[PDB]
Design a protein around this ligand. Structure first.
Ligand SMILES: Nc1ncnc2c1ncn2[C@@H]1O[C@H](COP(=O)(O)OP(=O)(O)OP(=O)(O)O)[C@@H](O)[C@H]1O
Ligand SMILES: Nc1ncnc2c1ncn2[C@@H]1O[C@H](COP(=O)(O)OP(=O)(O)O)[C@@H](O)[C@H]1O
Lengths: 482, 96, 223, 673, 240
């Protein structure tokens, strides 16, 4: 058995690229000026976007498998383009009269357009084409990273001078990216030896002391009463009411799912300890629960179902998981038991954050300009409250986290403190119609996929750096920190 | 089936496949002196009553189960009359 | 025997990491043929432990993947120490799985305080650890293990029979960021620095192993 | 169009991956479809209306209550559009948005349960704000013809809820292929269907209705199969009804009614008939085309085993219990009381009944502790129970045609409603219920009341007294333990006293003449029951015994009931069955509950109690039912909760349920022997 | 249809004169042929002749249609031509007119581009008002909304089409068409990939809507064909 997997070097990939389709693609030119730079542009694009995945979710949401099939494809086209253009050209002003805007659309949304499953990777890849292609062949400029002459062995020495280890600012990405790369490569490495190896003692007693610490159930015959006794967007605008206000029905829906999880955990903790201390024919699931209780990872019985029921999947057994579940029930209880609406809502605790926002939308249409405003006419916006120390329409959200700059006057993050708090981003809704702005996503978990995209936030704070600088930098406003 | 035998004893349409009547006519002759209705007459359904009386009086059932395995406890739980009417004289667990 | 019961469980992490005991027997009998007998049999017995480990070690690495390189070396250390040093499986699980007191440190760090708090781990999170006199620079300094050694238990770090495993439980609980260069460190200590070094298979040399009666498998990756 | 990874799915060789180029298609659309459908209809405000549709249906999907029969998919959208076609096709030139709001609202009104209506229309107001209100287009011929037949029948009362339900039914019949009438039992779905067919028949254009129930006949018989013995074909009943109905040159308008909840296995193969194809395909290779002469209706209660593929294929109308609900049901019973016994009885009973029921029922649930209602119920069952008990309390005076004062009736109310609400409680609950009655209720026995509850005493018919006793009787001279069968206990006597009252009543509405004890394992269930059964008169009153285990099936219960009756009493038969017969069950809880939570076992009994009879399984004929013109039913429960199973809540509405406590007097039972 | 031409001393030969596509029971689309196809002794001969004459007649009717689209006005040619030809005419109309407006913008600041945009805006109303609400026949019905989907997407692109000239990205983003006259032939253009129309009689078919994802896929397959490969799409159940 022999393994011959590839390395993660920019030169190494670039040098290999320069030993796949060479000495007949490079020598059959009939032009040393224009398309020679076009080849150099696409192969540099090729080696950069492939190596970008080294960092992880910051560079690419999921791994993609770009290969030369797209590269040597991208070539066959621009050749057919340039041959048919110059077939009617009886004389070249300066080596060409090309209008290189079609090649953008193609290299952007076709060749590497097949693998892309995410939406954000679309414009992210279009931005890379913009900064690298320049929309023109300058002939005389410094690549952000040098620029070639027109000889083959010159390309080899060009590749020879390239440094071995580079810095992520060649991708436009921040220098602190080295940390998270080691960490995830660290994590997945241990995770494998955690599978080389895959007990009935005091540990089951420790869990026995645990199940008398999680909060009790909320009997619906009481909860249906509670949500119905009191509820309203503002005490002055309306009397107490239940079903009609979107925030009370959201209260109910959240208490149901919370109760659904609280019942399962209390039961499985019991039946796990009620097999040795108690008596029952041993269950494979209970045995899997015992092994998970000893280790750090919670059992699958609380995270996934045959199709999927992700609830609060966090890493440790009790360090954060039961901590997060407790905090959710705590903030849900005072949101219920006292029944008043507190300031500084915690968006992470809610299972469905989107319904919270659309509920706010409906609230504004009903309470305000009602009639004057229709639900299809209201649009969404946000004003981030640039303050530390401190109702009106909109909400106050707590616990957001930014990555890579500050709240306002966004600057370069220091070496440490990769994840930074996000200040109070009060919301704002207005009816429609009644390019300096940068748009950011909001991901629930740090996995950064198409799902968990709750809403998008316009972040106008630019100064001298255009938003494309931030787009390549991959800034985002995530919610959890794990 | 054995649970319904314990409880009622009348198997649905097993002794009633055109045979209950002939079987009971083969017992009315014992009936006439057993119940002793002044040695005068009898009836029809009461003959079946006395027949089920006789069969449940003279049908003893001994069930002998394993204490170990997986099925015994859940079988007892599925059938209530199994453990219930049946007296439990408990065989000693081979003491010393 | 302790070494062999390590390469068995690597078949459980992934298929195709499967091999017999006969191949290990040929590797074992060979290792005695290669460099075992020169003179002074007792020192040659210690030449077994130095050479036998490296021979089987490099043989399994030829079929290992990149994400599995530091894995197999980590268990070989543990399985070696599960018999001689009598390392507790509970302490092993403490090294694999795991705040009111400290105020300056972060909630992300406070999770790790409650992580380490729950022998003397439950005895030195007090004012000794809450001194906050020079360890603040230590937590700030990159590579916290090498130059600015924690003096929390100096003598326990000097003994080194278990002080390595003690320092690694401290490193992982405090700073999971630098767990892995530290993983190379104590692997290089307990087993020798000759395991933490680059390897590259000369395909000319690999051809020498391949007789006519055995094929050459190739577990490749994309690109 | 390769596909990434299932069971039976392999990989492409690296030789083959070089050739192909990836193409990513992730998310389908909903808005462009809306606007192109508004086009296909013919509108002019397409782009704004599409946003209206999308936002309205999305909000109604997410922020509304979760009900299983709810559907807001592309099929509902396409139906709305194909309706809106004609609405613009008329000479109308008003703004399209008025017509659109009207169409959307009047289309989606039907399915929603009572609670979602205010939310629905308050959501409509947030999207159509410039429009304030539009009247619903009313059909004058229908709205005038309904009350004529409502009055022509004798026992029909006209209600605006009946009007609105029957008109929504009319509209959904106008629009869609087939429909379901979802709603609880005793709510009038069959009556609505009948009166609707009548109003369609009045102005010419006749209408016929056929009835069938799918889960009482086997599906292979329902649709016909190939014989497994002789290699020849056998017809299937549903297909025969279809071929007999869908012929042209007829004057009927046939409505095939399936009656009984939807299990996917048998209904999903009607996707072609309930879709736009309108074609039946059989495994025989036979296709038969649908005609406008035919409609498919499902008088099903509710959908619990239904996928969206069938939920969204046909229309639906939801009938609610409030048509006749709690105090309204009381009022209907008072209307029945003022029919014949109309001297003063309705008024003189109601003068207490009203306040005694409205201001008292909710102060017994959780006002006092009452934290052990072993049978968790809804109020309406306790109410219907006190009603059927009160009819049996007063039947004697109704027979002898005597009119009593108001105090006697107050005490009869108190006696009847002590039980039937106190029959689900234990001794400490009965004494707290007792002190509540002492505090704020009409007088109960006060003569001695020596540490005794109100439940011990009873109202005497001869005079206004609370006495109770058990007669003395020793044994026959025989010495068998069975000869020492049972003794005249006070618990047995009071059980008979409660039981006979409801067992004499002659099949009134809301009354099925069926009893239910609740006792612990070994708490004199069969003792008291058999004590009652021995008192039967076999010359006009028979008895049948049956027990339950886990694995008893419809074949078993169907067979034992068919062997009990031995005749089809429906077609003028059973001289020996012309006597009354009763069926006694020791434990209806034991049969297996399915993995979903719906035990299938009690459904046959449910149909037998509610409508009587069932569909035969004899390999000869399928669409037909045996009928039971007369049968009685009694059963016992074993303290449900925890390890003990529970009966479906749908059937709780029929059985008179009450407790059977331990005797607390076992010193006086074995004294005589 | 088969028309018997009676040759002298030979039994009358059945020749094809028109082709029809039937959907349902009555609804159908009929297409005449000027160039005829005659039966023969060899089956491949008259099959091939059917194919070739169909291709040629489709070509020449499209050649006349490219002219009649602009001369008569919308309603006339939309009602006269078939669905395929009407869609082609609408697309070529829109492309040519947007080109004209762009070049007039390139000359100086002009209203001409906006006036052409407004002409499309006007076409939308006269289309959607009448021929969508009331109509006879299933094929005539489906043709209409087949046009209206395309027209709504046309308008949706034309409102935000902020390109300065033909070279621009936003204009060389979509599926354009050009029926060249100097060499009489249709050419469907993508950014620069071009392919000639294949002239297969399809009648009225229910083509679907155009989402940016479908755009992405058009781009991808266009280049896959430019590079002589085969697009192999992948994904989850039912996404088009
Ligand atoms: N129409 C009906 N009326 C009354 N009871 C019914 C009816 N249909 C089914 N049942 C009940 O269902 C019981 C049989 O259960 P059934 O065999 O359907 O279970 P199942 O879902 O097939 O699961 P399994 O195959 O494991 O038994 C019958 O004995 C009967 O009590
Ligand atoms: N890119 C895509 N667009 C639309 N549908 C897709 C795509 N990929 C897969 N499908 C759908 O998936 C269904 C079958 O895929 P299944 O996912 O076969 O894959 P596997 O057999 O590998 O599990 C088909 O109905 C097909 O329409």
């Amino acid at each position: 058995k022999v393994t011959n997997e590839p390395p993660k070097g920019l030169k190494a990939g670039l040098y290999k690229t320069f030993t796949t389709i060479i000495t007949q693609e490079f020598i059959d030119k009939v032009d040393h000026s224009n398309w020679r730079s076009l080849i150099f542009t696409i192969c540099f694009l090729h080696s950069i976007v492939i190596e970008r995945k080294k960092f992880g979710p910051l560079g690419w949401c999921v791994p993609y498998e770009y290969n030369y099939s797209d590269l040597e494809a991208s070539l066959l086209y621009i050749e057919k383009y340039l041959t048919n253009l110059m077939s009617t050209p009886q004389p070249n002003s300066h080596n060409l009269p090309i209008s290189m805007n079609v090649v953008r659309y193609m290299i952007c949304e076709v060749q590497y357009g097949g693998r892309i499953t995410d939406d954000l990777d679309r414009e992210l890849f279009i931005t890379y084409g913009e900064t690298y292609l320049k929309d023109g062949i300058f002939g005389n400029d410094y690549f952000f990273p040098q620029n070639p002459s027109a000889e083959l062995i010159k390309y080899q020495e060009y590749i020879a001078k390239v440094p071995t280890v580079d810095n992520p600012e060649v991708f436009g990405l921040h220098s602190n990216a080295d940390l998270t790369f080691r960490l995830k490569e660290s994590k997945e490495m241990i995770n494998t030896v955690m599978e080389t190896r895959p007990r009935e003692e005091i540990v089951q007693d420790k869990a026995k002391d645990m199940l008398k610490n999680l909060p009790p159930d909320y009997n619906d015959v009481e909860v249906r009463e509670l949500v119905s006794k009191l509820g309203g967007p503002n005490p002055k605008t309306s009397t107490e009411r239940g079903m009609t206000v979107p925030l009370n029905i959201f209260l109910y829906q959240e208490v149901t799912r919370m109760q659904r999880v609280i019942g399962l955990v209390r039961k499985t903790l019991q039946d796990t300890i009620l097999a040795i201390d108690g008596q029952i024919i041993m269950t494979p699931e209970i045995l899997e629960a015992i092994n998970a209780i000893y280790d750090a990872k919670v059992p699958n019985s609380w995270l996934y179902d045959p199709s999927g029921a992700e609830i609060s999947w966090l890493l440790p057994n009790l360090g954060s998981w039961s901590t997060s579940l407790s905090d959710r029930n705590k903030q849900l209880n005072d949101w219920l038991r006292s029944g008043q609406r507190p300031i500084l809502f915690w968006l992470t605790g809610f299972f469905n954050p989107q319904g919270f926002l659309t509920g706010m939308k409906q609230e504004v249409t009903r309470n305000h300009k009602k009639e004057a405003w229709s639900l299809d006419d209201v649009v969404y916006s946000t004003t981030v409250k640039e303050r530390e120390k401190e109702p009106a329409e909109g909400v106050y959200i707590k616990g957001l986290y930014l990555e890579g700059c500050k709240w306002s006057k966004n600057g370069l993050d220091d070496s440490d403190p990769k994840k930074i708090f996000a200040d109070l981003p009060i919301l704002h809704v207005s009816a429609i119609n009644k390019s300096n702005t940068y748009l950011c996503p909001v991901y629930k978990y740090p996995k950064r996929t198409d799902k968990y995209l709750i809403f998008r936030v316009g972040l106008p704070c630019e100064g001298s750096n255009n938003p494309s600088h931030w787009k390549l930098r991959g800034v985002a406003l995530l919610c959890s920190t794990e | 089936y054995i649970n319904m035998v314990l409880s009622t004893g009348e198997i649905p349409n097993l002794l009633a496949k055109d045979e209950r009547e002939v079987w009971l006519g083969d017992i009315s002759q014992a009936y006439c002196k057993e119940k002793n209705l002044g040695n005068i007459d009898p009836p029809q359904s009461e003959l079946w009553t006395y027949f089920v009386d006789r069969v449940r009086d003279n049908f003893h059932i001994m069930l002998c189960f394993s204490p170990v395995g997986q099925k015994f406890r859940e079988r007892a739980r599925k059938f209530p009359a199994l453990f219930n009417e049946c007296t439990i004289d408990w065989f000693l667990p081979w003491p010393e | 025997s302790a070494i062999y019961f390590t390469m068995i469980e690597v078949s459980l992490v992934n298929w195709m990491y499967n091999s017999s005991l006969e191949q290990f027997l040929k590797l074992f009998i060979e290792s005695i043929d290669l460099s075992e007998k020169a003179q002074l049999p007792s020192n040659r017995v210690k030449n077994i432990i130095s050479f036998l480990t490296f021979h089987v070690y490099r043989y399994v690495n030829r079929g290992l993947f990149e994400k599995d390189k530091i894995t197999f070396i980590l268990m070989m250390a543990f399985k070696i120490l599960t018999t001689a040093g009598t390392i507790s499986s509970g302490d092993v699980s403490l090294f694999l799985k795991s705040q009111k007191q400290i105020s300056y440190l972060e909630d992300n760090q406070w999770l790790n305080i409650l992580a380490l708090s729950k022998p003397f781990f439950k005895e030195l999170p007090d004012l000794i650890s809450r001194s906050e006199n020079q360890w603040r620079n230590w937590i700030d300094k990159n590579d916290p293990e090498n130059f600015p050694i924690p003096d929390f238990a100096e003598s326990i770090n000097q003994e080194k029979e278990i002080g390595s495993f003690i320092s690694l439980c401290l490193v992982r609980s405090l700073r999971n960021d630098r767990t892995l260069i530290a993983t190379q460190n104590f692997i290089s200590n307990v087993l020798g620095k000759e395991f933490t070094d680059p390897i590259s298979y000369p395909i000319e040399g690999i051809w020498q192993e391949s007789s006519n009666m055995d094929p050459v498998l190739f577990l490749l990756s994309a690109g | 169009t390769m596909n990434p990874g299932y069971a039976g799915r392999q990989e492409l060789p690296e030789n083959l991956k070089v050739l192909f180029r990836g193409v990513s298609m992730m998310v389908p659309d909903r808005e462009i479809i809306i606007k192109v459908k508004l086009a296909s209809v013919g509108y002019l405000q397409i782009d704004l209306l599409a946003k209206k549709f999308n936002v309205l249906y999305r909000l109604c999907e997410e922020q509304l209550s979760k009900q299983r029969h709810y559907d807001f998919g592309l099929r509902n959208i396409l139906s709305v559009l194909r309706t809106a076609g004609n609405t613009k096709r008329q000479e109308i030139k008003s703004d399209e948005e008025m017509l659109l709001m009207r169409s959307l609202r009047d289309m989606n009104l039907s399915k929603l349960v009572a609670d979602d209506i205010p939310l629905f229309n308050g959501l409509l107001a947030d999207i159509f704000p410039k429009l304030k209100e539009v009247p619903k287009k009313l059909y004058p011929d229908v709205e005038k013809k309904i009350p004529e037949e409502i009055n022509a029948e004798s026992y029909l009362i006209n209600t605006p809820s009946f009007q609105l339900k029957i008109i929504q039914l009319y509209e959904t019949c106008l629009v869609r292929h087939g429909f379901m009438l979802v709603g609880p039992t005793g709510s009038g779905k069959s009556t609505i269907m009948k009166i609707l067919t009548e109003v369609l028949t009045k102005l010419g254009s006749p209408h016929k209705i056929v009835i069938m129930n799918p889960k009482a006949i086997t599906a292979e018989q329902m649709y016909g199969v190939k014989s497994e013995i002789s290699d020849d074909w056998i017809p299937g009943v549903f297909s025969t009804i279809w071929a007999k109905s869908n012929n042209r040159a007829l004057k009927h308008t046939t409505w095939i009614t399936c009656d009984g909840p939807v299990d996917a296995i048998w209904i999903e193969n009607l996707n072609t008939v309930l879709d736009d194809n309108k074609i039946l395909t059989l495994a025989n290779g036979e296709r038969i085309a649908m005609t406008e002469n035919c409609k498919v209706v499902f008088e099903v209660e509710n959908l619990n085993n239904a996928s969206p593929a069938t939920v969204s294929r046909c229309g639906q109308v939801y009938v609610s219990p409030t048509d006749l609900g709690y105090e309204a049901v009381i009022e209907g019973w008072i209307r029945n009381r003022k029919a014949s016994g109309r001297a003063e009885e309705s008024d003189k009973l109601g003068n207490i009944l009203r306040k005694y029921l409205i201001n008292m029922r909710f102060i017994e649930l959780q006002s006092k502790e009452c934290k052990e209602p072993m049978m968790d119920t809804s109020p309406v069952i306790s109410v219907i129970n006190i009603l059927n008990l009160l009819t049996g309390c007063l039947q004697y005076f109704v027979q002898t045609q005597r009119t009593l004062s108001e105090q006697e009736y107050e005490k009869f109310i108190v006696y009847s409603m002590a039980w039937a609400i106190g029959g689900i409680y234990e001794a400490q609950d009965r004494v707290r219920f007792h002190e509540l009655l002492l505090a704020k209720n009409a007088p109960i026995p006060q003569k001695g009341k020596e540490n005794e509850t109100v439940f011990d005493y009873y109202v005497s018919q001869d005079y206004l007294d609370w006495k109770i006793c058990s007669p003395e009787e020793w044994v026959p001279p025989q010495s068998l333990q069975f000869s020492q069968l049972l003794l005249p206990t006070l618990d047995s006597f009071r059980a008979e006293m409660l039981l006979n009252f409801i067992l004499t009543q002659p099949k009134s509405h809301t009354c099925s003449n069926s009893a239910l004890l609740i006792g612990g394992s070994g708490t004199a269930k069969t003792s008291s029951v058999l004590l009652y059964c021995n008192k039967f008169d076999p010359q006009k009153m028979l008895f049948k015994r049956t027990n339950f285990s886990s694995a008893t099936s419809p074949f078993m219960f169907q067979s034992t009931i068919e062997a009990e009756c031995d005749f089809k009493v429906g077609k003028e038969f059973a001289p020996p069955g012309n006597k009354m017969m009763t069926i006694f069950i020791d434990d209806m809880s034991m049969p297996f509950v399915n993995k979903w939570g719906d035990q299938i076992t009690l459904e046959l009994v449910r149909q037998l109690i509610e409508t009587g009879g069932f569909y035969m399984l004899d390999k000869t004929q399928r669409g037909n039912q045996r009928k039971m013109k007369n049968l009685q039913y009694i059963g016992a429960m074993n303290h449900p909760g925890g390890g003990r199973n529970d009966i479906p809540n749908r059937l709780k509405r029929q059985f008179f349920i009450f407790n059977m406590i331990l005797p607390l007097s076992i010193e006086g039972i074995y004294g005589p022997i | 249809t088969f028309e018997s031409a009676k040759d002298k001393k030979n039994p009358a030969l059945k020749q094809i004169t028109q082709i029809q596509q039937v959907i349902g029971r009555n609804e159908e689309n009929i297409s005449l042929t000027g160039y005829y196809v005659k039966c023969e002794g060899n089956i491949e001969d008259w099959l091939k002749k059917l194919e070739q004459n169909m291709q040629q007649t489709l070509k020449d009717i499209a050649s006349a249609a490219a002219q009649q689209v602009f001369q008569v006005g919308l309603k006339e040619f939309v009602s006269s031509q078939a669905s395929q030809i009407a869609l082609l005419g609408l697309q070529i109309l829109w492309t040519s007119k947007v080109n004209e407006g762009l070049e007039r913008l390139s000359r100086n600041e002009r209203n001409a581009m906006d006036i052409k945009r407004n002409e499309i805006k006007e076409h939308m109303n006269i289309l959607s008002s009448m021929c969508l609400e009331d109509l006879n026949g299933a094929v005539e019905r489906t043709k209409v909304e087949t046009l209206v989907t395309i027209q709504v997407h046309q308008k949706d692109i034309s409102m935000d089409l902020k390109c300065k000239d033909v070279n621009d990205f936003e204009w060389q983003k979509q599926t354009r068409i050009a029926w060249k006259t100097d060499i009489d032939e249709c050419i469907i253009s993508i950014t620069d990939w071009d392919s000639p129309y294949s002239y297969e009689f399809l009648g009225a078919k229910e083509r679907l809507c155009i989402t940016p994802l479908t755009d992405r896929c058009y781009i991808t397959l266009a280049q896959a064909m430019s590079m002589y490969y085969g697009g192999a799409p992948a994904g989850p159940a039912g996404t088009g």
